[PDB]
Each structure stands twice: as structure tokens, then as C-alpha cells.
Design a protein around this ligand. Structure first.
Ligand SMILES: CC(=O)O[C@H]1C(=O)[C@@]2(C)[C@H]([C@H](OC(=O)c3ccccc3)[C@]3(O)C[C@H](OC(=O)[C@H](O)[C@@H](NC(=O)c4ccccc4)c4ccccc4)C(C)=C1C3(C)C)[C@]1(OC(C)=O)CO[C@@H]1C[C@@H]2O
Ligand SMILES: Nc1nc2c(ncn2[C@@H]2O[C@H](COP(=O)(O)OP(=O)(O)OP(=O)(O)O)[C@@H](O)[C@H]2O)c(=O)[nH]1
Ligand SMILES: Nc1nc2c(ncn2[C@@H]2O[C@H](COP(=O)(O)OP(=O)(O)O)[C@@H](O)[C@H]2O)c(=O)[nH]1
Ligand SMILES: [Mg+2]
Lengths: 88, 433, 451
């Protein structure tokens, strides 16, 4: 259980980092129209982002949907999801 | 109880391992026959890091020697410390790889890897609380590179949560001894970048420079280079064996030195180094050790730090010394050379102190840098690799052993991506858009 | 057990084998009877190295060699010579005529009905070995037997064993001097088999060795014994990496892995640096740099060709004696800065280095001086094409008029084979002209986002 949770969390962190960098690079040139080299996008830090390299980057469009829970008892879940949904 | 399993593959790995066991046995006062005759009582306190106990109050190292040619094993056994090793850990075959990475990885090594893994697992199961592994090999060679990478892959498959170090001797531009260095180096780095927690960059050019210009040796040989390397390896894991004011485990070094998973290539160094007759002319103090550690010529990697920025550095001092001097010196080094340290880390100097120095010295220090300049090394290999891969200079010798042209391309792309990743944190600002 | 099997075919091959086995018997302390008092005095050791000598129960040592020839006289000399009791009595010498400088006679007519006995004894020897490395075949181009039986034997060896290396040493005919009128025919027809079935063929020329003997040793009247001793020294330097300890060993697989870029290019030149008389051994340092520089000089090459007219594609140095690595590194760095020596742009590394502790020995009654250091240089270059090209011209001058052709066809050959062989040689020359050409250009570009 600990190994699975740790690897899942690492994959999520890497995915969030790459999507944030991609979104920043998307926003920058879109308004500035400049070509600040090609940045560096850490695709290789995880197999998940590595396999999805073509879909994430280049010309593409992406959208993440996040579910919430209305129960008060599950507060620690909902807020946590928000902290991941705020990313990028 | 932290315990380390040592593996040594190939000629270079076996020679460095023999010298390393000589050094460690001297430090712990172990006779060549395996008995103990030391004086200080603290030598047996943590002797189980490297040695198993044997019934006659003897000690046997955890070394595991591997080679596809039996000559190096015969040389090691017929030596000053040959009898110390267990006879069952000498795993070897015949018809060596012959400088062919494919033979070492796919054809020949695939049959001996099972026996090597059996011995490694046997040593692992008897360890009270295993910490990690060590490997010594040469990337530019035959059996060493391929079998080391294969063993690293297998072990990381079996023991994912354990530390894995690697003291790898990488090729040099000027001092080249084999004509197929670039292919072997590329295909080895392609595996090391993925399946290793820490890698130490060593090359014979820097060690020859140290011998010529610091020790002033007229005719250095491989023994002296192995001596310097062994001093470094003994320095790295000192805090596991002896007490200290501020301890530093291997995992502490990994955590503090590695900001991102793929940047774990380090530049080692050792101080003090003096040329015999000059010894009386220079005092031994913490400022002198700090000055020698950060000197550009003391690095054992042939990469000038001045062409890049230090992502991190770690220093492990050995000897009775004041903490104020160490902290003040590291802060001063950070402040004065402000342009050679990355800006977005507030303090990138790890410090550790151990009370017990080496046998014949009052103080010593080991230095482990992590700087962007290492990319230069990889770039040089790439600068050669394509120059041979474009025309397929010696490619058939590989493709006759099961391999494929695509795999070379993946190795090249992975090394190029690593070089770019190191290169991004290398310019001294990012303001313009 | 790094075992190697030696094959000597033809007169030149068997004389080279005589000088050879003299050198190794001197090296290992084995008396010419086949015994070795060194172990008897000391009480035990590995001086009976398994590489060449198989040890029987009684203590005798039998060489791992097979002698083959069609002329009984040349082997009747060694069956009644000093080393008569060293060799096994089975010498496989056909009590019949000789090939008479004709490929067809030595391949189709008389090359048969002896080859089975040969292959049977190679089977027996190979069964006796453990971890056999390869074959060292000695013969001579131009000659009838040395071409025909070598071709048939190599074809059969490739068919049966296959994956075992088959190194070849041969006597290429000289540019000007020659000892037979049909040398170009036999050379141009055996080039077809030496290209496919061999793995690394070394060529040495009699005129070149005569020039080295005249210049460096001051022997104004040399014979074949001196040439054979030099070739034996070269072969000993090649093989010493797997008999004695050394700082950097170079097995027979590293040879081919480092000297052969493509399969059809395995024709490297060989040179031996510290060739010098006893009188001139003094007044000189004979350091590592001197011998390394002398290895590269055109005058010291063992084949009549100028390396300056080609390019160095691969290089392998094998040092013997009191040599340390840093001198070799210094010499290599010094050579790399010379403009006269050109390396192909697609081989940035270039050099293979091997070091051995055992120094070279001195043969009693010889001419080479005792030296502490030595080096043997094996260089794969494009200049060797010239050494072929001249011979091709001679072939044309003989084939336009179909001279001496009826002799070949009478024994079971057809005319077209000649043409076929010629075409093969032409193709080989084209390959040697295509590999040495520089790369096209950068041939690929990238833009740094110029907008
Ligand atoms: C007695 C004394 O004061 O003389 C020194 C000495 O002169 C110098 C030059 C020593 C000396 O080292 C060398 O000459 C040397 C040569 C080639 C490669 C490496 C070293 C010394 O040999 C080396 C030797 O070092 C040790 O004993 C350390 O414990 C060392 N162990 C070994 O060298 C060793 C040698 C053989 C077998 C087993 C161990 C060590 C270093 C790091 C970690 C653990 C152990 C020392 C004190 C000296 C001499 C004897 C002259 C130096 O040694 C080191 C690496 O610590 C080289 O520069 C340092 C500084 C010293 O001043
Ligand atoms: N270097 C060297 N070359 C030799 C020696 N003996 C013969 N040769 C070469 O061999 C050529 C003559 O052909 P051989 O090899 O003797 O042919 P063969 O072995 O007698 O076989 P047949 O032609 O059937 O008689 C000559 O041109 C020489 O150049 C020798 O002792 N040393
Ligand atoms: N430091 C050191 N390096 C060595 C030694 N022997 C070989 N090397 C290096 O290793 C390379 C050759 O690789 P090798 O050891 O033959 O690989 P192996 O055949 O798999 O064992 C050369 O480029 C040398 O620089 C040694 O004794 N000490
Ligand atoms: Mg004959």
C-alpha cells in the first residue's frame, strides 16, 4: 500500500509539473508571439508523462475534469482535490 | 545496522576493488589472513558494515567479483589480499565480451547474470538491515559496462527501495585506450541515467593531472589512480562506521544533493594532497582543506566547474575540528564565488564532520559536487558517437549479437535530453522574454 | 584455457612454422626434445602454457600444430632435423607430385584425397582443446599449394566450425621481384576465398623485409631465415597477450572488434618497431616514444606501400616489456598532432592500446638485439589498395592473350572463373575507395527559432 501510494503521488506531482510548464509556455507565446527557445519540459521523469508526450505537448488541447464530494466528513478529500485542480 | 554490499565487474572494477579492500582493511586493522590486530576499540564497533564474521574470530568482506575472463580473478587471488575474499564469490566464465557491449549485456552476460544474482541474493538475505549497493566498473569497456548495467537493472527490479551507488570510470578525449569507447559509453549512460540513485564521475585524465601536478609523481601507474579513487570511496561512507558531531548517511547525501531524479552525476574530490617533501611547508587547517577542495584542478572528472554552476555540493570532514570554522568557511566560499552557485537554492553546501581521521593524518576531507558543467563530458561523447554512427563505423559487430539500430537512437536521444536538462539551469539569469 | 591452433600450408608456411616453433620453444623453456626441465627443477608451475603446447602424462609437450604440403622433401627435412622428436609423427604429407604453381591442380585434382585426413586431424585437435579461440593459418600467395589447399581448407573450415576466428598470414607477391611467372594468376584467384572466409588477413612482402634487414640490421646478404624470424616475432607479439600477465590484455576478439569497421575491409598492415642490430642497439634510448614514432614511418612497413597516400582507419598497438601507460598516452597524443598522418573523420578515437610485461626473447644465432621495450603496430589503412592495384595490371597483361591458361583449364577449371575473380577484386578496390572518402557535409541543420 505504501509503495503504491508513493508511486501514485510521484506520478501525480510529475504530471502536474509538466502540465503547469506547458500551460505557462502556452500562455506566454500566445500573447507575446515570441519563441523563447523551446523551454525544457520534464517528460522523462515518469513513464506516464513519457507515453503521453505526443498528446500533452506540441500542437494539442487538453482538459482535466475533477470530481468533488459534498459530504462534510470527507472535507480532507475535497480540499485536497482543489489543491490539485488549482495546479496549472 | 547499516550494511553495504560491494560488487565489482571488469578489470578496472576488480583492480579498484582490490585496492579499496586494502585501504579499508588497513583502516579497520584487518590482517591479510582475515584476523584482527588493531589497537583502537572503535574499529570493531561498526565492522559489520563491510565484513561478515567467521568462526575463528575472522572477518570476510561482502565483495562480489564478476568478470567474463578468468585472468583478472587469477591476478586478484595471487595478490597481497587475495586470501581475504570468499572463494564462492568469484563468479566468472570464459570467452570474454571482447569490448563488445552487446556480448556483455545480451549474449554472454545473460547466462552468468543468474549465478551473480544468486550470490548477491545470498549475501542480501544475511544482512540485518541492508542500506544499499556499490558498483565499480568502466563505461568505456566490454564486460564491465554491460554486466554492470544489467546487474543494476536486475537489482533495482528486485530491491526498489535500496540505495544504489556507482563509481564509474568514464572515457576521456585525449587518453583513449579502445576504439569503440563512444558506443559503450552511450549505451551505458542510457541505463545509468534511469536505474541508479548516485553516480560518481571518474576519468583517468583528471587522475593523471592530479598525479603530475599535485603529487609530483614522475611515473604514475594504475595503482596510484586506484589509490586516489579508493580514498574517495572510503571518504564517502565514513559516517556509517565511526561517530561524529554531525553524521551524514548515504541517504542524507542523496536527499541533499539530488534536486530532480535525473540529475545524480557527481564530481568527487579529496584533500589534502601534497608531494612528500612539500609536506612540512604547508599547515593543515580547515581553511586549507576548503581551499584545496574547491580548487578547479583537484576534481577527478576533467570538468572545469568554472564553465557552469554548482547545483549542490557536499563536504565530509574527518578529524577533530571546530564547527564554527567549517560553517564560516562554507559561507565564505558561497558568498565570494556568488556567480558559480545556482541562485534559486538559498544554501547549497551540505557539511558533515567525523571525529576519527585517517591513520596517518590529523584531518582530511571528501568533496562531492553536482554542477551543470558535467554536461560537457556527455556532450563530448555525443560529439564522437554520431561521428561513428552516421557512417555505421563498427555497427555490425553489435547487430550480430541480437541488437538493433533503433536502440542506439534511443540511447543518443536520452543522453541529449539529459544534457539539455543540465543545460537549462546553467545561464546566470532568465529575465528577457 | 586460451588455446589456438596453428596451420602451416606450403613451403613458405612450413618454414615460417619452423622459425615460429623455434621461437616459442625458446620462450617456454621447452627443450627441442619436447621436455621441460624448468618444472623438474622448480617442482611445478604453469610454464607449460596451454595456448600452443598440450601436456601428456609423461611430461612431454606436443605442439598444437598441423603441417601440410604436397612436396615430401620440405617436411622430410624437419622429420630428420633437430625438432624431429617435438612433433607428432603424423605430418599429412602426400607422397605424390605438387601443385606446380597452379590453383586448379592444388584445388580440384590433387587438392582432393588428402583434405579428409587434414580435417580429421583438425577435428581431433579441436576435440582436445577447451575454449578454443581461433586459427592461425600460414601460407603464401602465388604458390600452387599455398593458394589451392589454403582455399579448399578455409572453405571447409568455414563450413564446419564457422564462428571460430581464422586469422591468416600470407606472403603477397612483391611489386618488382618474383620467383614464378604465374604468381598474379594464383593471387587473383585466391583473393576470392581470402575475402569471404577469413576474418583478418595480414600481408607481408619479401621486398619490404629485405629493405628492413638491409637498413636496420646491416645484413647485406639476407636469406629467408631472417624474414621468417621477423614474422615469427610479429606473431609472438600478437599472441603474447593471452599467455602472460599484463596491465592491459588484448584477446583475439578485441583484435577484430577494434580493427574491422566493415566485413570486407579486414586487411591491416603490420610493423615491428625495435628492429636493430646489436652494435646499433647502443647509442640509442629505445624509449616508448621512439619505437612508437618508428612504427609509423613509411620505411619500416612490411608491405611496399606508402601510408601517406591513404588514410589510417584503425590502429592497434601491442607493447612488450618495461612500458607504463603514461608514455603510451604521451606518444599517442604526439602522433595525433602530426599532419602527415591522416585519420578518417568517422573514427575520432582511432587507437587501441595493449601492454604486456613479458619482454621479447632473443633466439641464439639470431640477429635482433636484446631490448627491454618493444611494440608491434597493426594498422588498417586505405593505402593497401595500391598494393593490390599493380598486381591487377599484371593480371590484365597476362589475360589479354590468354597466356598459360591451358594449364589451368586442363586440371578442371573454366575461363569465366578468372573473370569472376577479377570482378570480385575490382569490387573490393571500389570498397576501399568508398570507405576512405570524407563525409558528405554536416548534412542536417537546425534553426534557433529566428522569429
Ligand atoms: C605519514 C605521513 O604523514 O605521510 C603521509 C603523506 O606524506 C601524504 C603525502 C600521503 C601519502 O600518499 C601518497 O603518497 C599517495 C600516492 C598516490 C596516491 C595516493 C596517495 C602516503 O603515502 C599515504 C598515507 O596515508 C594513509 O595512511 C591514509 O590512512 C590513507 N591510507 C593509505 O594511503 C594506505 C596505503 C596503503 C595501504 C592502506 C592504506 C587513507 C586515505 C583516505 C582514507 C583512508 C585511508 C600517509 C599518511 C602518508 C604517506 C605514507 C607517505 C597522501 O595520502 C593520502 C591520499 O591521504 C598523498 O597526499 C596525502 C597527504 C600526505 O601528506
Ligand atoms: N617470406 C618468405 N617467403 C617464402 C619463403 N619460402 C617461399 N616463399 C615464397 O613462396 C613463393 C614460392 O611458392 P611456394 O609458397 O613455395 O609454393 P609451394 O609451397 O612450394 O607449393 P607449390 O607451388 O605447389 O610447389 C615465393 O615467391 C616466395 O616469395 C620463405 O621462407 N619466407
Ligand atoms: N583506473 C584504472 N582504469 C583502468 C584500469 N584498467 C583499465 N582501465 C580503463 O578501462 C578501460 C578499459 O576497460 P576494461 O577494464 O578492459 O573493461 P572490461 O574488459 O570489461 O574489464 C580503459 O579505457 C582504461 O582507461 C586500471 O587498472 N585502473
Ligand atoms: Mg610447393
Amino acid at each position: 500500500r505504501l509503495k503504491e501510494g508513493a508511486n501514485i503521488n510521484k506520478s501525480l506531482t510529475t504530471l502536474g509539473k509538466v502540465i503547469s510548464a506547458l500551460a505557462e509556455m502556452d500562455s506566454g507565446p500566445n500573447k507575446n508571439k515570441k519563441k523563447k527557445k523551446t523551454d525544457f519540459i520534464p517528460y522523462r521523469d515518469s513513464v506516464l508523462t513519457w507515453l503521453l508526450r505526443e498528446n500533452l505537448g506540441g500542437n494539442s488541447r487538453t482538459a482535466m475534469v475533477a470530481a468533488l464530494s459534498p459530504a462534510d466528513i470527507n472535507y480532507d478529500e475535497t480540499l485536497s482535490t482543489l489543491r490539485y485542480a488549482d495546479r496549472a | 545496522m547499516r550494511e553495504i554490499v560491494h560488487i565489482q565487474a571488469g578489470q578496472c572494477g576488480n583492480q579498484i576493488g582490490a585496492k579499496f579492500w586494502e585501504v579499508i582493511s588497513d583502516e579497520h586493522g584487518i590482517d591479510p589472513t582475515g584476523s584482527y590486530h588493531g589497537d583502537s576499540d572503535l574499529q570493531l564497533e561498526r565492522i559489520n558494515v563491510y565484513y561478515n564474521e567467521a568462526t575463528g574470530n575472522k572477518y570476510v568482506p561482502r565483495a562480489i567479483l564478476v568478470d567474463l575472463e578468468p585472468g583478472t580473478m587469477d591476478s586478484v587471488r595471487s595478490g597481497p589480499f587475495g586470501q581475504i575474499f570468499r572463494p564462492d564469490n568469484f563468479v566468472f566464465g570464459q570467452s570474454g565480451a571482447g569490448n563488445n557491449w552487446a556480448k556483455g549485456h545480451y549474449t554472454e552476460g545473460a547466462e552468468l547474470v543468474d549465478s551473480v544474482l544468486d550470490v548477491v541474493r545470498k549475501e542480501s538475505e544475511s544482512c540485518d538491515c541492508l542500506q544499499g549497493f556499490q558498483l565499480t566498473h568502466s563505461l568505456g569497456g566490454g564486460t564491465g559496462s554491460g554486466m554492470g548495467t544489467l546487474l543494476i537493472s536486475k537489482i533495482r527490479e528486485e530491491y526498489p527501495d535500496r540505495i544504489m551507488n556507482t563509481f564509474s570510470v568514464m572515457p576521456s578525449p585525449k587518453v583513449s585506450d579502445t576504439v569503440v569507447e563512444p558506443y559503450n559509453a552511450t549505451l551505458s549512460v542510457h541505463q545509468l541515467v534511469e536505474n541508479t540513485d548516485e553516480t560518481y564521475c571518474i576519468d583517468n585524465e583528471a587522475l593523471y593531472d592530479i598525479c603530475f601536478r599535485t603529487l609530483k609523481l614522475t611515473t604514475p601507474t594504475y595503482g596510484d589512480l586506484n589509490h586516489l579513487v579508493s580514498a574517495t570511496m572510503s571518504g564517502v561512507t565514513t559516517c556509517l562506521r565511526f561517530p561524529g558531531q554531525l553524521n551524514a548517511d548515504l541517504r542524507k547525501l542523496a536527499v541533499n544533493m539530488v534536486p530532480f531524479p535525473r540529475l545524480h552525476f557527481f564530481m568527487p574530490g579529496f584533500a589534502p594532497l601534497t608531494s612528500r617533501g612539500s609536506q612540512q611547508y604547508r599547515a593543515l587547517t580547515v581553511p586549507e582543506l576548503t581551499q584545496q577542495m574547491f580548487d578547479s584542478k583537484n576534481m577527478m572528472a576533467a570538468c572545469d566547474p568554472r564553465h557552469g554552476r554548482y547545483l549542490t555540493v557536499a563536504a565530509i570532514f574527518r578529524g577533530r575540528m571546530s564547527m564554527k570554522e567549517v560553517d564560516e568557511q562554507m559561507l565564505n566560499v558561497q558568498n565570494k564565488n556568488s556567480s558559480y552557485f545556482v541562485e534559486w537554492i538559498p544554501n547549497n553546501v551540505k557539511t558533515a564532520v567525523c571525529d576519527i581521521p585517517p591513520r596517518g593524518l590529523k584531518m582530511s576531507a571528501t568533496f562531492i559536487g553536482n554542477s551543470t558543467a558535467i554536461q560537457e563530458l556527455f556532450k563530448r561523447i555525443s560529439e564522437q558517437f554520431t561521428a561513428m554512427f552516421r557512417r555505421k563505423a563498427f555497427l555490425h559487430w553489435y547487430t550480430g549479437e541480437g541488437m538493433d539500430e533503433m536502440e542506439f537512437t534511443e540511447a543518443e536521444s536520452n543522453m541529449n535530453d539529459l544534457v539539455s536538462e543540465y543545460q537549462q539551469y546553467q545561464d546566470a539569469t532568465a529575465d528577457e522574454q | 584455457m586460451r588455446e589456438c591452433i596453428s596451420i602451416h600450408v606450403g613451403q613458405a608456411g612450413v618454414q615460417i612454422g619452423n622459425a615460429c616453433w623455434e621461437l616459442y620453444c625458446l620462450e617456454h623453456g621447452i627443450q627441442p626434445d619436447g621436455q621441460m626441465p624448468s618444472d623438474k627443477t622448480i617442482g611445478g608451475g604453469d610454464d607449460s602454457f596451454n595456448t600452443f603446447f598440450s601436456e601428456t602424462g609423461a611430461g612431454k609437450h606436443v605442439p598444437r600444430a598441423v603441417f601440410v604440403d604436397l612436396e615430401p622433401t620440405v617436411i622430410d627435412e624437419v622429420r630428420t632435423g633437430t625438432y624431429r622428436q617435438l612433433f607428432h609423427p603424423e605430418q599429412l604429407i602426400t607422397g605424390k607430385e605438387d601443385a606446380a604453381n597452379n590453383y586448379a591442380r592444388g584445388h580440384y585434382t590433387i587438392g582432393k584425397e588428402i583434405i579428409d585426413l587434414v580435417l580429421d586431424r583438425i577435428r581431433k585437435l579441436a576435440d582436445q582443446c577447451t575454449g578454443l579461440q581461433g586459427f592461425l593459418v600460414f601460407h603464401s600467395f602465388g604458390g600452387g599449394t599455398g593458394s589451392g589447399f589454403t582455399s579448399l581448407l578455409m572453405e571447409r573450415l568455414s563450413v564446419d566450425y564457422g564462428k571460430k576466428s581464422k586469422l591468416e598470414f600470407s606472403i603477397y607477391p612483391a611489386p618488382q621481384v618474383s620467383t614464378a611467372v604465374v604468381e598474379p594468376y594464383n593471387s587473383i584467384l585466391t583473393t576470392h576465398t581470402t575475402l569471404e572466409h577469413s576474418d583478418c588477413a595480414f600481408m607481408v612482402d619479401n621486398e619490404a623485409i629485405y629493405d628492413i634487414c638491409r637498413r636496420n640490421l646491416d645484413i647485406e646478404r639476407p636469406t629467408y631465415t631472417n624474414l621468417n624470424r621477423l614474422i615469427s616475432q610479429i606473431v609472438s607479439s600478437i599472441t603474447a597477450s593471452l599467455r602472460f600477465d599484463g596491465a592491459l590484455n588484448v584477446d583475439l576478439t578485441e583484435f577484430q572488434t577494434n580493427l574491422v569497421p566493415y566485413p570486407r575491409i579486414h586487411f591491416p598492415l603490420a610493423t615491428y618497431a625495435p628492429v636493430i642490430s646489436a652494435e646499433k642497439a647502443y647509442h640509442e634510448q629505445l624509449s616508448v616514444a621512439e619505437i612508437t614514432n618508428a612504427c609509423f614511418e613509411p620505411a619500416n612497413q612490411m608491405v611496399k606501400c606508402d601510408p601517406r597516400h591513404g588514410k589510417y582507419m584503425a590502429c592497434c598497438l601491442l607493447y612488450r616489456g618495461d612500458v607504463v601507460p603514461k608514455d603510451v598516452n604521451a606518444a599517442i597524443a604526439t602522433i595525433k598532432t602530426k599532419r602527415s598522418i591522416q585519420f578518417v573523420d568517422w573514427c575520432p578515437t582511432g587507437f587501441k592500446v595493449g601492454i604486456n610485461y613479458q619482454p621479447p626473447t632473443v633466439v641464439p644465432g639470431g640477429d635482433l638485439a636484446k631490448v627491454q621495450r618493444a611494440v608491434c603496430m597493426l594498422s588498417n589503412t586505405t593505402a593497401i589498395a595500391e598494393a593490390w592495384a599493380r598486381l591487377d595490371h599484371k593480371f590484365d597483361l597476362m589475360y589479354a592473350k590468354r597466356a598459360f591458361v591451358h594449364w589451368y583449364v586442363g586440371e578442371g577449371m573454366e575461363e569465366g572463373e578468372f573473370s569472376e575473380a577479377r570482378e570480385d577484386m575490382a569490387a573490393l578496390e571500389k570498397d576501399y575507395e568508398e570507405v576512405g572518402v570524407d563525409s558528405v557535409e554536416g548534412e542536417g541543420e537546425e534553426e534557433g527559432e529566428e522569429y
